Every structure is written in C-alpha cells, then in structure tokens.
Structure 1
Amino acid sequence: GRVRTKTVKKAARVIIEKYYTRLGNDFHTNKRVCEEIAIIPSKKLRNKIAGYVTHLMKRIQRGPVRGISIKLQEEERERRDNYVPEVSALDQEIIEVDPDTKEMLKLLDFGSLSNLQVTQPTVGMNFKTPRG
C-alpha cells in the first residue's frame, strides 16, 4: 500500500497554505519549489511531499478543502456572505395568515391591518404519523 503519513501531509498542507501562488500542476516544477522553499533532509520525503502538493493542487482546482486556509479560495466566501439584494422577501404586498393568529393579533395591539389576508382552516385534523 501507498498511504502518506502525517508528516508528509502536514508539510504539504503548510506548503499549500503558505506558498500558493508559485505552484502548479507539474510535479517537477513544484518539486523544485519545495526543494528551495523548505529544508527536507532526504529525497524520497521530498518526492512524496511534492506528489501530495500536486494532488492537493488538483483538489484545490475543483473546490475548497477543510484543512487549507489560503487567500484565493476565500474572499469569494466573503463576497458571498456580504452580497445584499434589492427585494426584501419580508416586505410583501400580501401575507396569508391563520384565523386564530388573526384573533391573537386582534387582542395584542391592533384592530385591522391593510396587509393580511385570512385562509380557511383545514377540515381534517390528522397530523401524526401512524405509529401505535
């Protein structure tokens, strides 16, 4: 079997996190990059780290990874969490409401609002799944 240990995976993960722009999909190019940006005592460890960096690059090219915190794969998350629409989806010209909710709003503070319309209650009072 060929399963990478935790040292190779941690080294490749911090290499992907910390030096991301000067990388690529070629094994020899990021092999030389990992040769110069870090100190690896042996050569088999260098080749295994470079191979996992290539695999992680191919994985990043398809989507995000929950071990990696680079700059480029975020801030579209930030723009996605900060885009603001026009239509509120709560400021509606008509809103359906239940009759007991209408009577509850009658008692609370109001007599009549020009936004609500009332729907009929259900004629069947079945709501529970048959379990027994």
Structure 2
Amino acid sequence: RVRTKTIKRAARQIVEKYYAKLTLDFQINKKITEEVAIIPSKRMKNKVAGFVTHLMKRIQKGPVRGISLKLQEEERERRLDYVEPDTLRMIKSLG
C-alpha cells in the first residue's frame, strides 16, 4: 500500500514545532495533528497522524532521522563529559 511523499513530508514538518505538546497516547497524538495542522481532507487528517505515530514509536529506540530540539543537547554534553624498530631509529636519527 505504501505512503506518498506528500503525506511523508507533511508528517515530518510537524513534530518539530511542539514536541513538548506531543505525548505518548495514540488518540492524543491523533487529536493534536488536526488541532495544529491545516489539511482539509479528514482521511489525510488521520492518515498522516498514523505515520506520525509510526515515527514516534521509533524514538527511545534509536536515531529517528530528524528533530533537532532540546533533547539532543543533554546527550551531547553527557557523551562529551618501545616502538617499532624503524620508527625508533627515526626518533634517534632526528633527535
């Protein structure tokens, strides 16, 4: 069946704006999609939300390709904080 790039990019454009408002609940994440979006067809209004939920079930498991928000900085800071004979002769030849 697959999904079209129009709905894929419409699903990507959202999330980044109010991830602090998006939450775990599937129904809530559905409702906020029309609450925030502008799509006129209700079939999209739930079809894109399906993929949005499919995207957030990929978080807290690995990289999810996007979303540069307040949650990519704590990880960055936490993650931040004799020899081979020819080469010994090189050292001795140079000084």
For the superposition of Structure 1 and Structure 2, which TM-score range results when normalised by the shorter chain?
0.7 to 0.9
- Equivalence for 1:51: 50
- Equivalence for 1:82: 80
Instruction: Determine which structure has the larger helix proportion and give its number.
Output: 2
- 1:101 partnered with 2:83: no
Give unmatched runs, 5+ long, in structure 2: none
Structure possessing the higher radius of gyration over alpha carbons = 1
8 Å contact from structure 1 (residues 35, 46) kept in 2: yes
Instruction: Determine which structure has the larger strand proportion and give its number.
Output: 1
- The amino acid that maps onto 2:92 is K
SS of residue matched to 2:14: helix
- The amino acid that maps onto 1:82 is L
Q: Distance between the aligned counterparts of 2:84 and 2:34, measured in 1?
A: 70
| Alpha-carbon distance, 1:36 to partner | 1.3
RMSD: 1.8
- 1:7 partnered with 2:13: no
Q: Distance between the aligned counterparts of 2:19 and 2:30, measured in 1?
A: 13
Compared with structure 1, are the counterparts of its residues 65 and 101 closer, same or farther at alpha carbon in structure 2 (3 Å cutoff)? Answer: same
- Equivalence for 2:67: 68
- The amino acid that maps onto 1:99 is P
- The amino acid that maps onto 1:75 is E
TM-score norm. by structure 1 comes to 0.63
Larger relative contact order (Cα-Cα within 8 Å, sequence gap ≥ 6): 2
Tell me the matched-pair count.
95
TM-score norm. by structure 2 comes to 0.83
